[PDB]
């Protein structure tokens, strides 16, 4: 019974809408534009992870460092608790030493 | 479709308004002005005379030099007296 | 008068420049208005489909920021008190009503915050990917060189009919040198089309070159791409970012 | 207005060498015209454009660099190309009486 | 190439045809199924299965190996030891031969870095370049080179070829500026004075046998003759050489760049050099 | 207070080049460092070995596992199989056995078990690459 008895409504995808059609444009902004701009400057997203990557602990540390003062109170409390938990887990748990 | 205009660096110097509270403190000091002058030259609008130390800054620099960087003659004299003591 | 292009940059002695027909968009029949010599090290490199895959996947994933996030048992509302005592109730031991085992409880290993997937291939690898894409289009006869993108009219129907007559693909990627100097006729024609996409030369990329069946380049774009991509060859290891002044780098 | 679509089918003409050497004389002379080198862009463009206009079949960009000599041009132009779909290629291939092929596209 | 002809034969390369190079993508192993599930590679019950085994280096309570060994000053003061990147005469000859370093002009650390002959890391306590005798027997270049340390044999080879070598000190700040001048020029600061060597290094740079830049130039001919006598070559009179002016050019002991004085500001945007004229500033930058 | 001047030649001297310079012409080869330009015209072999961007022969030692020594001829164009045959012929007298090799036709490289970087560099110089 864990199965739907009707076909789901058809999902139509426009492969040639503007977003898909122009996807990838300016990814070579650096090597084709005399390196005035780095391609990572094209990234739109959270201010604390534009052109940067890390595990959950590093992401949380960076978020606290960069926008911690602007965070809501309980969100910041949750982030502090999460950093503490992730520190304990990554530095004290695991199969490997 | 046509591509949106390519991203470009903002031309010329960028001067944040000091009145705004959200402007970072590093964008307001003299170091920012010096870097803007170096990057854009006269178009920056930075008065070139501000690049060198003001007389009080020069006095501080001279005091630090006198305190920590001895003259060649003083270094040689210290080396000579140390060698004499060792001998 | 034929429009003949020669290779500005030096060509390796053991290699001969590859060649393409210089065409025009001014008429349906203007399929050969000249002959262009293209640098083999940009247009006749080895067919590195694996490098194409590397660059395409980098383009897809380096900008990606997934915003999926779940609440852990620490962040789900409530769940402080122990539901019932350890022993006596005859029920399983539990410490909170928000553990992952519970309905409405936390997620043990769900997605965590906005995660970035950012990474940079070496710029030599990315430039090589561009070169491989260009060679692939040329070798598979999907690359068409134009003297200019000037059209007789800004009517999209003319452009679509021209592509259909010349047996271009269902999708065309037209590339002009810079954004500002693009002819108004081609700008108007392509602004209303979905599969005919017009980009500046600085916007050229492997993903869009592969998405579009045919690639249309102007002669200035060909010269520009040759210069930029060949510069990656025979360049020093950087002393500092190339945005900073160098002796010979614009 | 879009002209009728140019059929890609091409059967090399019988007097192809004669036509080619006439065009070669028009463009460029020495003995063994087969070995005339097309390293000159003007001459290559003239010869190939004339041939494309006359025969309704141009050398593709992919094969354009390998036309080093008039011999290469002759070899390219004496190989037929047929544009018939796979449906035709199969149906008009002496199908055995017990094999039936239908196409609904 | 035949590969491009094969491409001509093959279907269009699209985003539906792409495949990673075989061997570049190991399969992901996840703990599901008979072989990788159940205990999931963690073993039977215990600390290691619970994930709570003790820290790296713990030995179960026995005094650890890395603690039962006595402390010894192997790395005492490691971050204050001066480091000098070696530049062998082999490497120098290679750079000159390939034209990455121009011997017709004075060779200093800026020229070596710009030719990419050496990589200096002032942040990692690099104090410059030390000339290295390796390749001396095949060194055949007449060069005016400024280094920070120089072996006796390297000096001998340089001088036997008719060249000049001087050992000049650079403090960390001056060294950073010399190695990467363009970023310093973009900092928009007046060119600072090159500091004097520390007291421990002063005798080295005032000794003529090291060709120290602070040494008495009167003693240089004697030391050069001593090296020529020791290593069995005739000392060439560089004054007769047509490049003698280049071989003689030496920056002032307080000067970071050859033609730029301390205190100047390099405006690269409009290709200018602003020079202070205030008497106090001039005295400071000349002191 | 401020006095501008044009002594910018001493800054142009400090500006570094982004492009690797072409090696200067030498009266006699091999050059004192042992470097030698490729011969002109190129050899008519079925394969070509392009120089590195620093104008050296692209032959590199490689090591894996701490004990697997290999040498790689990297920038090969044309008949990599002809190059493999030539390398085997040139190296078998040295080893006493035919060397074991991998031909990466895709990347255009040839990998030989064992260290032969110096011998292969000299051999490619003799062939004129
Ligand atoms: Mg709680
Ligand atoms: Mg919930
Ligand atoms: Mg098992
Ligand atoms: Mg268990
Ligand atoms: Mg156990
Ligand atoms: Mg390796």
Swiss-Prot record, chain B:
Basic residues composition bias: residue spans: 1-12
Cellular compartment(s): Mitochondrion; Nucleus
Superkingdom classification of source: Eukaryota
Induction description: Down-regulated by p53/TP53 in apoptotic cells.
Residue ranges of the region described as Disordered: 1-22
Subunit structure: Component of the mitochondrial large ribosomal subunit (mt-LSU). Mature mammalian 55S mitochondrial ribosomes consist of a small (28S) and a large (39S) subunit. The 28S small subunit contains a 12S ribosomal RNA (12S mt-rRNA) and 30 different proteins. The 39S large subunit contains a 16S rRNA (16S mt-rRNA), a copy of mitochondrial valine transfer RNA (mt-tRNA(Val)), which plays an integral structural role, and 52 different proteins. Interacts with GADD45A, GADD45B and GADD45G. Interacts with NR4A1 via the NR4A1 AB domain. Interacts with ATAD3A and ATAD3B.
Family of the protein in this entry: Belongs to the mitochondrion-specific ribosomal protein mL64 family.
Extra remark beyond the main annotation: Cells overexpressing GADD45GIP1 were more likely to be in G1 and less likely to be in S phase and grow more slowly than control cells. Inhibiting the expression of GADD45GIP1 promotes cell cycle progression.
Protein name as annotated: Large ribosomal subunit protein mL64
Gene: GADD45GIP1
UniProtKB/Swiss-Prot annotation, chain C:
Highest taxon of the lineage: Eukaryota
Ribosomal protein recorded as keyword: yes
GO CC annotations, alphabetized: mitochondrial inner membrane; mitochondrial large ribosomal subunit; mitochondrion
Region spans: Disordered: 74-105
GO molecular function, one term: RNA binding
Modified residues annotated as Omega-N-methylarginine in this record: 103
Compartments it resides in: Mitochondrion
Keywords in alphabetical order: Methylation, Mitochondrion, Ribonucleoprotein, Ribosomal protein
Single Gene Ontology BP annotation: mitochondrial translation
The protein's assembly and partners: Component of the mitochondrial large ribosomal subunit (mt-LSU). Mature mammalian 55S mitochondrial ribosomes consist of a small (28S) and a large (39S) subunit. The 28S small subunit contains a 12S ribosomal RNA (12S mt-rRNA) and 30 different proteins. The 39S large subunit contains a 16S rRNA (16S mt-rRNA), a copy of mitochondrial valine transfer RNA (mt-tRNA(Val)), which plays an integral structural role, and 52 different proteins. Interacts with MIEF1 upstream open reading frame protein.
Family the entry assigns: Belongs to the universal ribosomal protein uL4 family.
The protein's name in its UniProt record: Large ribosomal subunit protein uL4m
Source organism of this protein record: Homo sapiens (Human)
Designated gene of the protein: MRPL4
Coverage span on the entire protein: 45 to 294 of 311
UniProtKB/Swiss-Prot annotation, chain D:
Family of the protein in this entry: Belongs to the mitochondrion-specific ribosomal protein mL50 family.
A GO BP annotation: mitochondrial translation
Residue window of the full protein shown: 51 to 158 of 158
Major subcellular location class: mitochondrion
Protein's name according to its UniProt entry: Large ribosomal subunit protein mL50
Subcellular location: Mitochondrion
Keyword Repressor (UniProt): no
Keyword set, alphabetical order: Mitochondrion, Ribonucleoprotein, Ribosomal protein
GO cellular component, one term: mitochondrial inner membrane
Mitochondrion among keywords: yes
Lineage: Eukaryota, Metazoa, Chordata, Craniata, Vertebrata
SUBUNIT field: Component of the mitochondrial large ribosomal subunit (mt-LSU). Mature mammalian 55S mitochondrial ribosomes consist of a small (28S) and a large (39S) subunit. The 28S small subunit contains a 12S ribosomal RNA (12S mt-rRNA) and 30 different proteins. The 39S large subunit contains a 16S rRNA (16S mt-rRNA), a copy of mitochondrial valine transfer RNA (mt-tRNA(Val)), which plays an integral structural role, and 52 different proteins.
Coiled coil region boundaries: none
Taxonomic source organism: Homo sapiens
Swiss-Prot record, chain F:
Organ and tissue specificity: Ubiquitous.
Family of the protein in this entry: Belongs to the mitochondrion-specific ribosomal protein mL49 family.
Biological-process GO terms, alphabetical: mitochondrial translation
Entry keyword set: Mitochondrion, Ribonucleoprotein, Ribosomal protein
Shown residues within the full chain: 38 to 166 of 166
Highest taxon above the source species: Eukaryota
Any one GO MF annotation of this record: structural constituent of ribosome
Cellular component GO terms held in the UniProt record: mitochondrial inner membrane; mitochondrial large ribosomal subunit; mitochondrial ribosome; mitochondrion
Region named Disordered: 19-41
Subcellular location: Mitochondrion
Protein name (Swiss-Prot/TrEMBL): Large ribosomal subunit protein mL49
Assembly with partners or alone: Component of the mitochondrial large ribosomal subunit (mt-LSU). Mature mammalian 55S mitochondrial ribosomes consist of a small (28S) and a large (39S) subunit. The 28S small subunit contains a 12S ribosomal RNA (12S mt-rRNA) and 30 different proteins. The 39S large subunit contains a 16S rRNA (16S mt-rRNA), a copy of mitochondrial valine transfer RNA (mt-tRNA(Val)), which plays an integral structural role, and 52 different proteins. Interacts with OXA1L.
């Amino acid at each position: 019974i864990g199965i739907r008895l009707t076909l789901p409504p058809p999902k139509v995808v426009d492969r040639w809408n503007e977003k898909r059609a122009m996807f990838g444009v300016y990814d070579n902004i650096g090597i084709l534009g005399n390196f005035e701009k780095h391609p990572k400057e094209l990234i739109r997203g959270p201010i604390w992870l534009r052109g940067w990557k890390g595990n959950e602990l590093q992401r949380c540390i960076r978020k606290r460092k960069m926008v911690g003062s602007r965070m809501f109170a309980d969100d910041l409390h949750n982030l502090n608790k999460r950093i503490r938990y992730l520190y304990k887990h990554f530095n004290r748990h695991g199969k490997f030493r | 479709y046509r591509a949106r205009p390519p991203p470009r660096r903002r031309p010329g110097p960028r001067w944040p308004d000091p009145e705004d509270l959200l402007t970072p403190r590093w964008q307001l000091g003299p170091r920012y002005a010096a870097k803007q002058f170096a990057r854009y030259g006269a178009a920056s609008g930075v008065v070139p005379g501000s690049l060198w130390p003001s007389p009080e800054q020069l006095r501080e620099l001279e005091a630090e030099e006198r305190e920590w960087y001895p003259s060649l003659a003083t270094m040689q004299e210290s080396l000579r007296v140390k060698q004499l003591a060792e001998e | 008068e034929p429009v003949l292009r020669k290779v500005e940059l030096p060509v390796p002695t053991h290699r001969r420049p590859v060649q393409a027909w210089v065409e025009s968009l001014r008429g349906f029949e203007q399929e050969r208005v000249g002959l262009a010599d293209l640098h083999p090290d940009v247009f006749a490199t080895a067919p590195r489909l694996d490098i194409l895959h590397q660059v395409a996947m980098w383009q897809k994933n380096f900008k990606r920021i997934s915003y999926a996030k779940t609440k852990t048992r620490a962040e789900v509302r409530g769940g402080g008190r122990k539901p019932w005592p350890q022993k006596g109730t005859g029920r399983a031991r539990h410490g909170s009503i928000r553990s992952p085992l519970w309905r409405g409880g936390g997620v043990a290993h769900g997605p965590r915050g906005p995660t970035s997937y950012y990474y940079m291939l070496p710029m030599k690898v990315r430039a090589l990917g561009l070169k491989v894409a260009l060679t692939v289009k040329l070798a598979q006869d999907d690359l068409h060189i134009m003297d200019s993108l000037e059209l007789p009219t800004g009517d999209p129907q003319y452009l679509t009919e021209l592509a259909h007559y010349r047996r271009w693909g269902d999708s065309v990627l037209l590339v002009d040198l810079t954004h500002e100097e693009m002819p108004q006729s081609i700008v108007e024609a392509t602004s209303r089309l979905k599969t005919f996409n017009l980009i500046p030369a600085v916007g050229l990329n492997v993903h869009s070159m592969l998405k579009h069946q045919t690639l249309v380049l102007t002669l200035p774009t060909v010269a520009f791409l040759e210069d930029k991509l060949l510069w990656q060859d025979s360049r020093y290891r950087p002393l500092y970012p190339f945005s900073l002044p160098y002796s010979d780098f614009p | 207005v879009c002209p009728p679509l140019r059929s890609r089918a091409y059967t090399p003409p019988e007097d192809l060498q004669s036509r080619l050497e006439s065009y070669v004389k028009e463009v460029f002379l020495p003995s063994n015209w087969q070995d005339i080198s097309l390293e000159d862009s003007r001459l290559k463009f003239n010869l190939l454009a004339h041939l494309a206009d006359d025969l309704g079949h141009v050398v593709p960009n992919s094969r354009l660099h390998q036309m080093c000599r008039v011999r290469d041009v002759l070899d390219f132009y004496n190989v037929p190309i047929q544009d018939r779909s796979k449906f035709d290629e199969l149906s008009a291939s002496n199908l055995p009486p017990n094999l039936k092929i239908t196409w609904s596209y | 190439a035949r590969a491009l002809d094969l491409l001509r034969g093959l279907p269009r390369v699209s985003l539906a045809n792409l495949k990673p190079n075989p061997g570049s993508k190991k399969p992901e192993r996840r703990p599901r199924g008979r072989r990788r599930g159940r205990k999931c590679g963690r073993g039977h019950k215990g600390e290691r299965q619970r994930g709570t085994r003790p820290r790296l280096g713990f030995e179960g309570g026995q005094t650890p190996f890395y603690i039962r060994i006595p402390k010894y000053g192997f790395n005492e003061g490691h971050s204050f030891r001066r480091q000098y990147k070696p530049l062998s005469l082999n490497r120098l000859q290679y750079l000159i031969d390939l034209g990455r370093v121009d011997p017709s002009q004075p060779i200093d650390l800026t020229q070596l870095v710009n030719g990419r002959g050496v990589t200096i890391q002032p942040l990692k306590r690099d104090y410059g370049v030390q000339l290295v005798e390796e390749g001396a027997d095949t060194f055949t270049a007449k060069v005016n080179i400024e280094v920070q340390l120089a072996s006796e044999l390297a000096i001998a080879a340089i001088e036997k070829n008719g060249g000049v070598v001087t050992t000049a000190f650079y403090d960390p700040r001056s060294l950073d500026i010399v190695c990467k001048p363009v970023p310093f020029f973009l900092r928009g600061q007046p060119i600072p004075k090159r500091m004097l060597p520390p007291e421990e290094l002063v005798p080295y740079y005032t000794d003529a046998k090291n060709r120290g830049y602070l040494a008495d130039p009167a003693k240089f001919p004697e030391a050069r003759l001593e090296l020529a006598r020791k290593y069995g070559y005739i000392l060439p009179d560089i004054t007769k050489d047509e490049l003698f002016k280049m071989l003689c050019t030496r920056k002032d002991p307080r000067q970071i760049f050859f033609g730029l004085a301390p205190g100047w500001v390099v405006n690269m945007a409009d290709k200018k050099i602003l020079k202070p004229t205030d008497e106090n500033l001039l005295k400071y930058y000349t002191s | 207070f401020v006095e501008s001047v044009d002594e910018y030649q001493f800054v142009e001297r400090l500006l570094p080049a982004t492009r690797i310079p072409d090696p200067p012409k030498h009266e006699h080869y091999p050059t004192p460092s042992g470097w030698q330009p490729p011969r002109d015209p190129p050899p008519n072999l079925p394969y070509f070995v392009r120089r590195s961007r620093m104008h050296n022969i692209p032959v590199y030692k490689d090591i894996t596992h701490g004990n697997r020594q290999m040498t790689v001829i990297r920038k090969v164009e044309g008949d990599i199989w002809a190059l493999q045959k030539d390398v085997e012929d040139f190296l078998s007298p040295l080893l006493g056995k035919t060397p074991v090799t991998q031909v990466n036709e895709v990347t255009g490289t040839l990998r030989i078990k064992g260290y032969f970087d110096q011998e292969l560099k000299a051999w490619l110089l003799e062939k004129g690459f």
